[PDB]
Amino acid sequence: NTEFALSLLRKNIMTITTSKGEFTGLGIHDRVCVIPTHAQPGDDVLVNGQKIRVKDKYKLVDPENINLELTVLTLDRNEKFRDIRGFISEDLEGVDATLVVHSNNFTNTILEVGPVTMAGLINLSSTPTNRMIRYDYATKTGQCGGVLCATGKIFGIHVGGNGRQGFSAQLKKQYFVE
Numbered sequence: 044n045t046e047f048a049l050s051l052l053r054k055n056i057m058t059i060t061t062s063k064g065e066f067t068g069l070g071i072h073d074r075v076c077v078i079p080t081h082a083q084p085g086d087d088v089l090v091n092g093q094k095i096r097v098k099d100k101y102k103l104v105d106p107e108n109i110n111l112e113l114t115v116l117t118l119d120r121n122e123k124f125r126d127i128r129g130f131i132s133e134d135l136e137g138v139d140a141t142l143v144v145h146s147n148n149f150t151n152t153i154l155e156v157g158p159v160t161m162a163g164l165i166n167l168s169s170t171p172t173n174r175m176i177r178y179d180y181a182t183k184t185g186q187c188g189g190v191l192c193a194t195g196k197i198f199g200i201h202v203g204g205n206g207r208q209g210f211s212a213q214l215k216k217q218y219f220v221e
């Protein structure tokens with residue numbers, strides 16, 4: 044698990060800074076990356092401290108117009124991400140997953156969040172959010188955007204918690220299709 048998590052840290056996971064602070068950003072493919080919606084990125088963000096113009100941005104909502112707490116960004120930079128869409132899996136039920144963080148004080152951080160489960164529709168920051176993956180791990184401030192994953196499987200992006208549970212926005216391959 045650590046070897047797969049380390050591979051994501053070298054080739055896909057970066058630190059993205061908005062006006063709301065530092066967030067772990069996962070590069071999906073080409074110049075497309077994901078970030079929690081509550082980061083509220085503007086026309087420009089910092090990628091590992093470098094000012095990068097945001098070409099495209101759109102918040103993800105399910106077909107039932109329910110918030111997904113995920114925002115897909117297209118960056119105007121030269122480096123193309125490694126295509127990790129093949130690792131995105133929806134078979135997460137009961138998997139002992141790992142959260143890969145690279146933001147704030149948690150740089151190059153690999154956490155064992157225990158077994159995950161599809162919580163579904165929960166009230167996240169007074170906003171109903173669907174496709175919620177829950178793990179019984181005390182995630183902390185500065186870890187939003189961490190990549191929930193296991194060996195050869197990417198499950199979602201951490202979006203919040205309550206000091207005892209943590210929640211990740213489910214990643215699906217259909218999100219990156221026009």
Ligand SMILES: *[C@@H](CC(=O)OCC)[C@H](C[C@@H]1CCNC1=O)NC(=O)[C@H](CC#C)n1cccc(NC(=O)c2cc(C)on2)c1=O
Pocket residue numbers: 063064065066081165166167168169181182183184185186187202203204205206208209210
């Ligand atoms: C990441 C954001 C951060 O670190 O600062 C940004 C620079 C945090 C991670 C949370 C904080 C506590 N433990 C975590 O894992 N995310 C949030 O703080 C989000 C922001 C949004 C949207 N947030 C804000 C307000 C409430 C909650 N949590 C819940 O509403 C909730 C519901 C249930 C059920 O359990 N928790 C929240 O995540």
